[PDB]
Amino acid sequence: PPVHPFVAPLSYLLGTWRGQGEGEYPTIPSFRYGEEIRFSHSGKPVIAYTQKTWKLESGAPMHAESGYFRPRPDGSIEVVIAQSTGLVEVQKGTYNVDEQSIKLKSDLVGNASKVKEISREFELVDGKLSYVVRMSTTTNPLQPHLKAILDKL
């Protein structure tokens, strides 16, 4: 089906992306990971999102998550994600056409033992998809947990 007019401003996302990231937090040792993301659609005002990650040295599967991006013509967007670890998140924010960026902060984090808020910020930089994920916990304020850069395949 054709791309819905609400999805068209984010059409740069559509496809498969692969790259690598670094994870961190004051409470844990830093680590690296490989990541692959697919964004797809079915003609609705919604983009399907799927992630998988792995250990670089072994290819051993790590975290996965999936969900839906719902952009609107006023530049607002909501994103819902379920994670393999048993969390859900509702993200709300805005996208910027000139910057090809998306800025989100959680309205809800469900089924967490420790996490309170999550923010996710994406930007296309020289055609590569970059993001930073920040989180707050019961013992730590909102700060980075993940950063990755992915090439479009």
Residues that bind ligand HEM (CB under 6 A): 23, 25, 27-28, 31, 33, 53, 62-63, 114-115, 118, 133, 135, 137, 145-146
Tell me whether residue 63 is annotated as binding: no
Quote the CA–CA distance of 150 and 73 in Å, as a whole number: 26
> What is the length of the chain?
153
Tell me whether residue 27 is annotated as binding: yes
Is residue 89 a contact point for its own copies (CB under 8 A)?
A: yes
Which of 27, 30, 42, 113 lies at the binding interface for its own copies (CB under 8 A)?
42
Quote the CA–CA distance of 53 and 36 in Å, as a whole number: 6
Residue 28 interacting partner from its own copies, ligand HEM, none (CB closer than 5 to 8 Å by kind): ligand HEM
Is residue 68 a contact point for its own copies (CB under 8 A)?
A: yes
**How far is CA 30 from each of CA 59, 120, 144, 147, rounded to the nearest angstrom?**
18, 19, 11, 11
Is residue 1 a contact point for its own copies (CB under 8 A)?
A: yes
Quote the CA–CA distance of 48 and 51 in Å, as a whole number: 10
* Binding region for its own copies (CB under 8 A): 1, 42-44, 46, 48, 50, 52, 61, 64, 66-68, 70, 78, 80-84, 86-90, 107-108, 110-111
